């Protein structure tokens, strides 16, 4: 019955989404934004010039007063002369550092996927979809003349295996873990009162312990905390919106519409290949329906299930 | 018995992982992070402007006080006027330098592998996998009609040789050695007390030895030690987590699932080719199972061992 449904199989599989659309969307948002927020912070933390400012006495010089700002900038680490809450202080100093920490931490599971599992996905999808075309092509030619094909047996092989889905879930689980850790850190950082960005520093160490010309206390002010709290809540808001998305990517079997192989039951050369117990077949169903565009036989089957009327 | 298992051998081997997924993952983490930490340090060590600040008397000028900061910055090298612990001081001055030292030291074994062993891996994998397809293709055609093939003899040749695995292990051993040396350095640098970033400098040399207007002692402060200790522990944490990974890459025979050639026993034209005594065959088994995607015959054998039921 081949009158207008013949496939030359001339165009190969050039563009294959080796990672799902949601995973690419999450990775771009989860990694891009902290990179963009730091680029935002670094751009305007150098526009203002300084990151800490301490009110030195008028008797100080421009290098005596710069020392106070420089000494007290490093004195944030030392939890003996600042005061109250000392943990909120060195988080203010290290917020752009930590913002990059989970910026690149959230990039590793995508990087690991592109190294250890993406090439395996590429070939298996290429094999499954090429053999799907061959099955459909031979199916119509069998009808043109008028058991357990290669595709079906290969899918059962993936159902009994779970090595690749473990890589996928662990990459998604690590992304969830790092996002949740980032949510805790960004949530705690935004929880810090904006009045806690000023600390009463004191330069009394070494020969300056008994020095009388040096005031006992200096009123410092981390002036970049204001922008950081804006960036923390901005990054927290997306991460508490990305977290429900990421946990949805963990449920590999459940995120299927069961419309990937249901259309192949029409062929006479053919199948409950939907999902079962978080197997590698369940993961391949995600990548088959995501990369269901480049397979030319699938579109021919869509009409066939819609031509029975 | 060739009904749906024929291979045209049209697509060549375009993307071959000439280095293992773990090696790429380790190299990116082991080299990328110190590069990123320095980029982090350099970005914010110029945002604060200065790296050392000394409290000069109010009678000094802006170039007399800049001299004190400049002289005492270089005086860290001279272990005669700083004081206590002098080794921790010039490590503070040279920490970003040394951080790059093993950043590029950890890059050389990957660079050496890409120069001296990667092309050899590329051809041998191309030869083994192309001949594997030919063996499988002739195997089914022999069954379609109804001793020691090229692949098996070539593998035995690699079993008697170890020149390439010596290159691999030495590259991994050098990476382990440099990481362990970095762990010792970063571990020791973080072991330095944060109160040791301030040293009582003294400008008494040359004509200034008898000068009375110059104070005998200057209270200096390396203000970049606070961020460095954060970067040291951050880099130490990953390196003490990379070290168990790197030592695992050394055990070439043991890091195999024995699922690379076990599926080729089905063919009638065929084999204990798993590993033995750290030979070049053991290394090729790693690269065969890592680059087991691009070989089209392997996926056909996976069903064959799963079609016997
Ligand atoms: C390769 C190349 C890649 C290009 C580089 C990346 C481009 C953008 C990077 C920066 C970035 O993400 O902007 C962020 C936006 O990010 C988002 O808006 C995503 C929020 C959750 C998405 C799921 C829907 C809700 C779940 C339901 C469960 C920043 O913008 P924001 O103002 O913080 O937006 C957050 C505010 N609202 C609108 C989300 C409330
Ligand atoms: C990952 C990033 C975590 C940052 C923790 C950090 O440096 O804060 C620091 C260390 O705290 C920790 O390191 C403990 C929590 C992490 C333990 C992980 C075990 C292995 C996980 C398995 C998967 C917190 O500061 P601290 O050391 O508490 O400072 C002392 C302050 N007091 C308590 C003396 C006042
Ligand atoms: C990003 C843009 C949207 C997108 O593309 O994804 C979409 C929806 O996915 C969602 O956005 C999920 C919505 C909320 C789920 C909450 C789970 C439980 C919460 C727990 C809260 C606790 C958290 C803290 C612990 C699509 O995702 P999908 O499955 O690809 O859709 C199928 C599309 N193909 C592949 C068939 C073409
Ligand atoms: C070509 C292009 C390449 C792209 C360029 C490189 C991209 C990233 C570079 C920077 C970077 O590595 O970020 C680092 C992360 O690195 C890691 O988290 C890896 C840790 C060990 C990995 C094995 C598992 C445990 C072993 C079991 C035995 C920095 O982030 P961090 O906050 O220091 O992370 C360390 C904290 N935890 C989560 C690991 C506790
Ligand atoms: C590699 C990087 C090592 C850095 C060592 C360094 O410069 O510190 C320096 C040299 O110390 C060394 O060089 C000895 C250790 C290395 C010897 C390798 C032999 C060949 C290896 C084969 C494979 C240490 O400083 P020092 O010279 O001890 O300064 C004198 C200080 N006191 C002791 C007088 C107070
Ligand atoms: C990085 C991400 C993970 C990854 O890809 O590697 C994974 C696991 O490898 C590990 O992560 C090792 C786990 C701990 C080993 C400890 C050894 C003894 C400790 C000593 C402590 C003392 C240290 C100081 C002296 C995979 O590695 P592999 O072998 O490629 O897996 C096979 C996958 N293919 C190739 C078949 C597809
Ligand atoms: C950083 C971003 C991401 C971290 C990557 C996490 C990897 C987790 C998936 C497990 C994996 O592939 O490695 C597995 C670890 O187990 C490897 O398989 P294996 O079982 O180690 O290989 C057989 C080796 N034995 C057991 C025969 C010795």
DSSP A198-255: --EE---SGGGSS-SSS-S-EEEEETTHHHHHHHHHHHHHHHHHHHHHHHHHH-TTTS
Give residues (CB < 6 A) around ligand 7.
A 108-109, 112, 166-167, 170, 174; B 25, 254-255, 257
CB contacts under 8 A, A 146-185 vs B, are 148-150, 153-154, 156-157, 160
Report residue B240: phi and psi, to 5°. -75, -10
| 3-state SS, residue A147 | coil
Distance, CA of B29 to CA of B27 (rounded, Å): 5
Contact B72, B218 (CB under 8 A): yes
Distance of CA A2 to the CA centre of its chain: 46
CA atoms within 13 A on the CB side of A210: 1
Give residues (CB < 6 A) around ligand 1.
A 28-29, 32-33, 36, 234, 237-238, 241-242, 244-245
* Among B92, B109, B113, CA closest to B30: B109
Distance, CA of A230 to CA of A234 (rounded, Å): 6
Distance, CA of A17 to CA of A38 (rounded, Å): 29
| 3-state SS, residue A55 | strand
User: Which residues of chain B lie closer than 8 angstroms to A213, CB-CB?
Assistant: 58
Cα–Cα–Cα angle for B159, B123, B257, nearest 5°?
50
Distance, CA of A55 to CA of B93 (rounded, Å): 28
Q: Using the beta-carbon criterion (under 8 Å), do B226 and A45 form an inter-chain contact?
A: no
Task: Return all residues near A112 (Cβ < 8 A) that are at least 6 apart.
Answer: A167, A171, B21, B25
Pocket of ligand 4 contains residue A115 by CB under 6 Å: no
Two tokens, residue B227: 């961020």
Residue of B nearest to A48 (CA): B47
A24-52: b (≥16 Cβ within 10 Å) or e: eebbebbbebbeebbeebeeebeeeebbb
CA atoms within 13 A on the CB side of B60: 22
Q: Does B65 touch chain A (CB under 8 A)?
A: yes
Resolution for this experimental structure (Å): 3.4
Distance from the first to the final alpha carbon of chain B: 17
Helix axes A21-47, A225-250, angle to 10 degrees: 170
Neighbour count for residue B38 (Cβ, 10 Å):
19
A144-155: b (≥16 Cβ within 10 Å) or e: eeeeebbbbebb
CA distances in angstroms from B256 to A129, A161, B200, B245, B259, listed in the order given: 29, 17, 58, 15, 8
Residue with tokens 């989404």: A17
Q: Does A205 touch chain B (CB under 8 A)?
A: yes
List the alpha helices (DSSP H) in chain B.
21-47, 64-75, 87-105, 108-116, 118-145, 150-159, 163-191, 225-250, 280-290, 296-305
**How much distance in Å is there from the Cα of B234 to the middle of ligand 4?**
10
Closest CA to ligand 3's atom 5: A22
Q: What is the CA radius of gyration of chain B?
A: 30
Task: Kindly tell me the sign of the dihedral angle through the C-alpha atoms of A182, A188, A191, A196.
Answer: negative
CB contacts under 8 A, B 237-276 vs A, are none
Task: Return all residues near A176 (Cβ < 8 A) that are at least 6 apart.
Answer: A243, A246, A247, A250
* Among A17, A24, A19, CA closest to A242: A24
CA atoms within 13 A on the CB side of B52: 27
Select from A62, A104, A116 the Cβ nearest to the Cβ of B21.
Answer: A116
Residue of B nearest to A119 (CA): B293
Select from A73, A104, A123 the Cβ nearest to the Cβ of B48.
Answer: A73
Distance, CA of B86 to CA of B150 (rounded, Å): 65
Q: Does A11 touch chain B (CB under 8 A)?
A: no
Experimental method: cryo-EM
């Amino acid at each position: 019955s081949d009158f207008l449904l013949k496939e030359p199989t001339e165009p190969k599989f050039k563009g294959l989404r080796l990672e799902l659309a949601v995973d690419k969307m999450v990775t771009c948002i989860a990694v891009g934004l902290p990179l963009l927020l730091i680029s935002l912070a670094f751009a305007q933390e150098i526009s203002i010039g300084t990151q800490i400012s301490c009110f030195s006495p008028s008797s100080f010089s421009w290098r005596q007063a710069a020392f106070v700002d420089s000494y007290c900038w490093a004195a944030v680490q030392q939890k003996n002369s600042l005061q109250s809450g000392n943990l909120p202080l060195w988080l203010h100093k290290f917020f752009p550092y930590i913002l990059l920490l989970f910026a690149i931490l959230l990039y590793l599971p995508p990087l690991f996927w592109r190294f250890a599992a993406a090439p395996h996905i590429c070939s298996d999808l290429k094999f499954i979809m090429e053999e799907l075309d061959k099955v459909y092509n031979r199916a119509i030619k069998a009808a043109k003349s008028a058991k357990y094909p290669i595709v079906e047996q290969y899918l059962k092989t993936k159902k009994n295996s779970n090595n690749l889905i473990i890589k996928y879930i662990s990459c998604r689980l690590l992304t969830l873990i790092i996002i949740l850790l980032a949510c805790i850190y960004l949530g705690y950082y935004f929880s810090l009162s904006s009045l806690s960005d000023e600390f009463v520093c004191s330069i009394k160490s070494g020969i300056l312990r008994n020095d009388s010309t040096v005031p006992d206390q200096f009123q410092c002010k981390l002036i970049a905390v204001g922008i950081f709290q804006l960036l923390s809540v901005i990054n927290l808001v997306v991460y508490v919106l990305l977290a429900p998305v990421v946990v949805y990517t963990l449920f590999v079997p459940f995120r299927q519409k069961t419309d990937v192989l249901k259309v192949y039951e029409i062929l006479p050369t053919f199948l409950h290949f939907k999902s079962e117990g978080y197997n590698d077949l369940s993961l391949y169903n995600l990548f088959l329906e995501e990369n269901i565009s480049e397979v030319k036989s699938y579109k021919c089957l869509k009409v066939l299930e819609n031509i029975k009327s």
